[PDB]
């Protein structure tokens, strides 16, 4: 499995973010520590 090209069916993945951007820089008013949470309402393992 190192000479012939491989093929395989892969699930498509997507990323999602809120509108929150945090940075660290000298002489900036940004606060360093931050926190958030995610609630998982439903996961269907092995859908495909």
């Amino acid at each position: 499995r190192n000479l012939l090209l491989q093929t395989r069916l892969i699930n498509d993945v997507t990323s999602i973010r809120p509108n929150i951007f945090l940075g660290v820089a000298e002489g900036s008013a940004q606060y360093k520590k931050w926190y958030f949470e995610l609630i998982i309402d439903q996961v269907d393992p092995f859908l495909t």
Binding site: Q6, R8, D12, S15, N19, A29, V43
Partner: protein
């Protein structure tokens, strides 16, 4: 892309009714997690803190999740750790929260697809104040006396206000009693207050001088006219002091004086913000908690209008006081600066294109391009062979029209037609029957300066043409190829009866479309590479086989002093588990005339996709994964990276003539070491099992003869060919097979736009349920995997 098994109570994959708490600390920096309120024994640390950090969730079809960011944008189900702030405080008062895809080159709405350019930046929210530097501004002595008056008048502007707010003079200040010891005459004022007022007035004077404004004392008789205000006895406190602020109601300010007042207010705001930042304060959302949280440390534009006026009133009072005394201010015009603009790199412009197999070699074809955002965009036809790293139409591979400047591009630029505006529709027609190309803007033909409708004519067909468009920064467009000609807007007005058919006419399924993405990738150096050349040197009895890299066009008028990123074609994979010889070796010889300070030599993993004009080992992608015990004691710490190299500068510092650097890798232990001229350097790296490392040299050329890979051998160390090719594993003869070739990084590539996309749905559930993201319909694709490149 390497998982590290972390220890937790009730370990299990994320499932329904799971609450994941994520904590970030840019101070260390460190990223840590919690599952259902229970800590996870591990964290990330020592990563690059450049750029902006945002929360993110990656998912495939079949999930529903809810972001909780505190406040009204989500109710936290667990107490944040002490000192950690909810994410909703990172928004500006103007900004409204939303959920968006991380990267996006297209947006579909109700079956209409908009092709997007690139966004220049994001919501930085980093003020980084830079007030005018008045340290070198020297206050003229003759302006001090008037200044000494103004601050005194400023003192009145304080004291009277204390009377107007109900404050009463007392020995000791009391908030409940509205008391303050400072409620006294300027002469009787404490030394600290007078020093503060004098320092503020001197700062203002230096700010005015630094702006270039010229102060002229032209009204000596105005000071006599100026009078105070006879405040009644109710103002005076028990001490016997009654404020006498100067009567400045009659004073009027010019528009230039108003501009000066506004600029002074902005400068004062920036100075105060810098002072607060130095004090440890930080911007907050509608909270002024004394833990160095102030909601006003923002840019002046975003500042509250009331907050602006709070100090603008005092600044205008000072300006009117100055005008009354006769010190007129004359600022200089700002047009003397003569500003300029920058040029957007070709890597940041996004090309969209129809697939080469749809190229047309005959007939008359028509397609439209709607410009949602009027701006820097180009549209036209492209030959198979058009490259994504060259501006559309700057060569002979594309015939385009640019409507922002009203030009036409083919092997150059020529003014043609007229510029467009938002909501315009460009109809592009090609007549391959008689080699003609026509454009229309809103159903009206665009004609050249000579009155001809033919934007282009008399071209060689060769392979054919496909529709192409190029979108700049923040630009949007809609390419309509005619899959439904009734969706055309000006096809019937100009295009239908003239014999032009929609490009995608009599087609059953949508047209495959490609785009250009900026993902740097190593590709083999061609025989026609314009900058570098590679020569193979066979291995003799003493000299091992070599690959000599030299600069084609250095020292001439076409010299390009830019970095070169070279890699070897085949990798050297470490063993899957760690504990005849298991060590591999290769060397690099840098010829005389190549400065060793501009040469980095080592290994790169397959996931190295960095390209920049200036390279530096300090600015490298890295991270450390710490794994702790049940009590948090660290029992492991893994450091990742994608570039294990050494700098020639450090070697020469610890050490004209050619310089030889040898790189050795213990595969059984995954240990990388380096040695310059036999002596072993102290720079050693450790890598995990199953790690593929390609030999790599990154250098800025200073001579025509650059360097050479030497695929030699030494005792207890295999040659590179032996470690790469299993056929020569037993054979100890060094070899350089034709599959082993030198590759260089190229920064842009074509990439196929997927036929279908995940249907993600976002929605604000409520003020306590946060934001919902769901994806339910499954999607898949058949991927082809190139094994060596991983």
């Amino acid at each position: 892309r390497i998982p590290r098994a972390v220890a937790s109570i009730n370990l299990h994959l994320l499932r329904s009714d799971d609450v994941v708490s994520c904590c970030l600390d840019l101070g260390v920096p460190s990223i840590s997690f919690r599952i259902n309120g229970q800590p996870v024994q591990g964290m990330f640390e020592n990563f690059n803190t450049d750029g902006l950090f945002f929360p993110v969730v990656s998912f495939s079809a079949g999930v529903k999740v809810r972001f909780l960011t505190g406040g009204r944008h989500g109710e936290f189900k667990f107490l944040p750790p002490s000192g950690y702030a909810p994410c909703y405080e990172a928004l500006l008062p103007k900004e409204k929260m939303r959920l968006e895809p991380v990267k996006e080159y297209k947006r579909d709405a109700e079956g209409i697809r908009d092709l997007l350019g690139t966004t220049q930046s994001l919501s930085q929210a980093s003020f980084i104040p830079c007030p005018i530097d008045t340290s070198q501004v020297v206050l003229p002595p003759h302006l001090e006396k008037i200044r000494d008056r103004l601050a005194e008048n400023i003192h009145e502007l304080w004291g009277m206000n204390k009377i107007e707010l109900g404050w009463t003079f007392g020995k000791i200040r009391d908030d409940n009693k509205r008391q303050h010891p400072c409620l006294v005459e300027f002469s009787k004022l404490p030394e600290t207050e007078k020093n503060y007022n004098l320092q503020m007035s001197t700062e203002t004077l230096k700010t005015l001088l630094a702006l270039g404004c010229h102060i002229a004392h032209v009204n000596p008789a105005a000071e006599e006219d100026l009078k105070k205000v006879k405040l009644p006895k109710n103002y005076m406190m028990s001490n016997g002091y009654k404020p006498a602020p100067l009567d400045l109601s009659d004073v009027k300010l010019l528009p230039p004086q108003e501009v000066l007042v506004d600029k002074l207010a902005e400068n004062a705001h920036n100075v105060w913000a810098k002072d607060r930042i130095k004090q440890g304060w930080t911007y907050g959302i509608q909270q002024d908690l004394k833990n160095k949280r102030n909601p006003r440390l923002v840019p002046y534009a975003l500042l509250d209008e009331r907050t602006k006026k709070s100090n603008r009133d005092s600044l205008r009072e000072a300006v009117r006081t100055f005008v009354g005394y006769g010190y007129n201010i004359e600022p200089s015009d700002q047009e003397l600066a003569d500003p300029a603009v920058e040029k957007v790199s070709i890597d940041k412009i996004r090309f969209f294109r129809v697939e080469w197999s749809y190229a047309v070699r005959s007939g008359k074809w028509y397609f439209e391009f709607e410009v949602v955002t009027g701006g820097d965009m180009r549209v036209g036809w492209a030959r198979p062979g058009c490259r994504p790293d060259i501006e559309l139409g700057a060569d002979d591979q594309a015939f385009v029209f640019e409507g922002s400047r009203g030009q036409r591009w083919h092997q150059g630029s020529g003014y043609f037609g007229r510029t467009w505006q938002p909501g315009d529709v460009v109809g592009c027609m090609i007549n391959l029957d008689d080699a003609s190309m026509i454009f229309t803007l809103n159903g009206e033909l665009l004609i050249t300066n000579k009155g001809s409708e033919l934007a282009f004519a008399d071209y060689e067909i060769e392979n054919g043409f496909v529709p192409i468009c190029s979108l700049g920064l923040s630009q949007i467009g809609r390419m309509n190829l005619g899959m439904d000609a009734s969706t055309f807007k000006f096809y019937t007005m100009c295009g239908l009866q003239e014999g032009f058919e929609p490009f995608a006419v009599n087609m059953n399924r949508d047209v495959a479309m490609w785009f250009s993405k900026r993902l740097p990738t190593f590709v083999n150096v061609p025989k026609d590479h314009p900058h570098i050349e590679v020569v193979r040197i066979d291995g003799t009895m003493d000299s091992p086989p070599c690959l000599k890299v030299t600069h084609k066009t250095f020292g001439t008028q076409n010299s390009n002093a830019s970095m070169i990123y070279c890699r070897l074609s085949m990798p050297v994979e470490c063993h899957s588990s760690f504990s005849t010889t298991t060590q591999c070796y290769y060397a690099i010889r840098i010829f005389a005339g190549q400065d060793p300070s501009c040469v980095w030599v080592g290994w790169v993993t397959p996931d190295y996709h960095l390209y920049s004009e200036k390279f530096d080992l300090n600015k490298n992608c890295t991270v450390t994964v710490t794994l702790g015990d049940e009590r948090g004691r660290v029992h492991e710490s893994v450091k990742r990276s994608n570039c294990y190299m050494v700098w020639g500068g450090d070697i020469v510092a610890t050490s004209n003539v050619d310089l030889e650097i040898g790189c050795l890798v213990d595969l059984a232990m995954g240990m990388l070491s380096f040695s310059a001229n036999g002596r072993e350097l102290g720079t050693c790296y450790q890598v995990e099992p199953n790690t593929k490392v390609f030999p790599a040299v990154f250098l800025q050329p200073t001579s025509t003869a650059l360097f050479q890979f030497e695929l030699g051998k030494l005792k207890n160390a295999m040659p590179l060919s032996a470690a790469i090719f299993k056929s020569e594993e037993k054979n100890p003869v060094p070899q350089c097979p034709p599959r082993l070739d030198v590759q260089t990084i190229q920064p842009v590539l074509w990439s196929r736009m997927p036929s279908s996309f995940l249907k993600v749905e976002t929605e604000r559930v409520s003020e306590r349920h946060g934001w919902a993201v769901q994806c339910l319909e499954p999607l898949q694709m058949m991927a082809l995997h190139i094994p060596e490149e991983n």
